[PDB]
UniProtKB/Swiss-Prot annotation:
Annotated localization: Secreted
Gene that this sequence comes from: GNBP3
An example Gene Ontology biological process: antifungal innate immune response
Described purpose of this protein according to its UniProt entry: Involved in the recognition of invading microorganisms. Binds specifically to beta-1,3-glucan and activates the phenoloxidase cascade.
GO MF term (any one): lipopolysaccharide binding
Entry similarity comment: Belongs to the insect beta-1,3-glucan binding protein family.
Keyword terms of this UniProt record: Glycoprotein, Immunity, Innate immunity, Secreted, Signal
Parent-protein start and end of this portion: 26 to 126 of 490
GO cellular component, one term: cell surface
Top-rank taxon, per record: Eukaryota
Protein name per its UniProtKB record: Gram-negative bacteria-binding protein 3
Domain CBM39, residue spans: 1-101
Length: 101
């Protein structure tokens, strides 16, 4: 199984969203992230959230408070339970280059 690569949308003045599409057999998505500093292994990070449920065909993490700027880098890893087994998107990095809304 391959965890879908997370889609990251950054909002102005603040907030961001991290999501993946859902499919049969996924029962959890979790996001672990840090800003402008690498994750040290599979640590919890600054943001560590298990998304409660899929909604509208996606699993979505939403931050409403953090003001990201162009050139900021989000470092992250995600976890999915697929058919009862755990899998990750490892070594995620996203450089903010622009806003979605
Ligand atoms: Zn892989
Ligand atoms: Zn289907
Ligand atoms: Zn740490
Ligand atoms: Zn976790």
């Amino acid at each position: 199984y391959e965890v879908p690569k997370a889609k990251i949308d950054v909002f102005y003045p603040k907030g961001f969203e991290v999501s993946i599409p859902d499919e049969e057999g996924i029962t959890l998505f979790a996001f672990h992230g840090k800003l402008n500093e690498e994750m040290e292994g599979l640590e919890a990070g600054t943001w560590a959230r298990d998304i409660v449920k899929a909604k509208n065909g996606r699993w979505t993490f939403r931050d409403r408070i953090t003001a990201l700027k162009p050139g900021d880098t989000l470092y992250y890893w995600t976890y999915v339970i697929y058919n009862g087994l755990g899998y990750r998107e490892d070594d995620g990095s996203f450089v903010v280059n622009g806003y979605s809304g």
